[PDB]
Structure formats: structure tokens, C-alpha cells
């Protein structure tokens, strides 16, 4: 196994680059959420790419959960609480998280 890479702060660009990478690979798109799954992702990214796993967070409350870090372009969408990863390019241009919960900023 290859060892841990150095830590680096998240950036809009990086967030976007990754959003797109994971969409391109498909994989994540349309997969059901789970703390364990999300942790799996956050790990891979933190170890492989050195980005601390505080970034991939989403708004609270019943309904669609919007991403907190600008340029992470996946939201969590109920399906029928019970949620599935969903990509949304608009989220690269709109900070829905901040529009709905500006108290975080």
C-alpha cells in the first residue's frame, strides 16, 4: 500500500474537480447514502488526495440536503428519511446551502 499524502485545505476548484471526477466515474451518482459509505469516501479522499474530511457536509432538515462546501456539486435527494446522492451542475454556480442556511456563514 502507498502511504498517506500531506494535508492541504479544500478549495472551490478542488471541490469542483472532484465533483466532476466522481460524476465521470459514475459510481457515486445515484447511490443510496449511509454514514459508513460517506466515511468510506471521505477516507479515500483524505488518504489519497490529502483533503481533510470536514468538507463533504450537507444541510439538515427533511427534504433535499444541499452541500455546504461551494463547488461540491452533489446533493442528497430523498427517494421513498432515506437519501440518494444526486449530481447537480447548478450547485457549482449556486450556493443553495448559504441561501437556505446563511447562519453557517
Amino acid at each position: 500500500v502507498r502511504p498517506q499524502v500531506p494535508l492541504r485545505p479544500m478549495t472551490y476548484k478542488a471541490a469542483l474537480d472532484i465533483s466532476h471526477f466522481l460524476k465521470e466515474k459514475g459510481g457515486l451518482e445515484g447511490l443510496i447514502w449511509s454514514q459508513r459509505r460517506q466515511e468510506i469516501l471521505d477516507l479515500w479522499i483524505y488518504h489519497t488526495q490529502g483533503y481533510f474530511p470536514d468538507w463533504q457536509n450537507y444541510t439538515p432538515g427533511p427534504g433535499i440536503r444541499y452541500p455546504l462546501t461551494f463547488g461540491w456539486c452533489f446533493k442528497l435527494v430523498p427517494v421513498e428519511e432515506v437519501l440518494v446522492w444526486r449530481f447537480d451542475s447548478k450547485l457549482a454556480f449556486h450556493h443553495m446551502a448559504r441561501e437556505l442556511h446563511p447562519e453557517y456563514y
Partner: protein
């Protein structure tokens, strides 16, 4: 005057980082502070950021 080499593989996700395989050699372009240095591959010629701890001096091991 100072050359480093890939101890391990690395593959990037961001366009600004430099993917490589073990043995790929590097000239260093930016040791600003960020442990992610800017580097140029002596195998491809491409330039981008890499994790500093993946590479070693061509004088040590």
C-alpha cells in the same frame, strides 16, 4: 541541481496535480511551503503539484 524520484505510484483527480509511477524522476518548480510542491516529470515532461513525501533525493535511497 536537485532531483527527486517517485518512491510510489500516485494518480490525481484534480487537473493541477501530477499523476506518476514509481521511478518517474522530477525537477522541482515550487517549494513555496505547501507540502504539495510543483514539479516536472522527466518521463512525460508535464508540470503540476505532487505530494512531497512521495519523492526522495537521487542521492539517498
Amino acid at each position: 541541481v536537485t532531483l527527486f524520484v517517485a518512491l510510489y505510484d500516485y494518480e490525481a483527480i484534480t487537473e493541477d496535480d501530477l499523476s506518476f509511477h514509481k521511478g518517474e524522476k522530477f525537477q522541482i518548480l515550487n517549494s513555496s511551503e505547501g507540502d504539495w510542491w510543483e514539479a516536472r516529470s522527466l518521463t512525460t515532461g508535464e508540470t503540476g503539484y505532487i505530494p512531497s513525501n512521495y519523492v526522495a533525493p537521487v542521492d539517498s535511497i
